[PDB]
Symmetry: C2
């Protein structure tokens, strides 16, 4: 996005090596995203059902999003952990409770880790 | 018993004076043991199965016998272990076999020990 004073001719041309310095608003030259195709190529990666939320999130953050679907594929919904368990796990012989869903609270006690 | 050449009357005197010496074989002095009075003790104590073998064994080693009978209630026929296991127990990641009877051998792995 353009600034208040513009630029200095000699200053701008020397730094740019001579690439197209767009006069217009950066996000006007950028071409519309094929929303249905994202929705369509997001469905072969996952199981099937994909919400509008899933759709923009990806576009906005392509690889960052692909990665989140690796971790919910693995460990489920990690938000449900209390913060200390999320960061540090558990110390030996502790009892922790995790509510994975309304009325499904698992009581987890780690006894010892081995060799 | 009596030494080939008897005792020196002096030495004996300074050693044992307080009580007095035996002249005959020690067993003559003591009356018989009552093995029936014994059998009932051992009956009453371990609630049933008691033989002539236990009777002389109790009578010969009163404290040590009582004790072994303590270990056999606790640990069972230990003599059946292979001698390495007897003395050392096990190490983690070790797989050991114990014949408790002909055809009944137990396969026992120590995974780990906790803190």
């Amino acid at each position: 996005g353009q600034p208040v004073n513009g630029f200095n001719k000699d200053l701008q041309a020397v730094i740019l090596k001579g690439q197209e310095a767009l006069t217009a608003r950066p996000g006007e030259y950028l071409e519309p995203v094929d929303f249905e195709k994202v929705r369509e190529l997001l469905e072969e990666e996952q199981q099937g059902p994909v919400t509008e939320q899933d759709i923009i999130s990806y576009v906005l953050y392509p690889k960052v999003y692909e990665q989140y679907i690796q971790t919910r594929n693995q460990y489920g919904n990690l938000s449900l952990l209390d913060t200390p368990t999320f960061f540090f796990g558990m110390r030996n012989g502790e009892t922790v409770e995790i509510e994975i869903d309304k009325g499904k609270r698992l009581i987890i006690k780690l006894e010892t880790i081995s060799e």
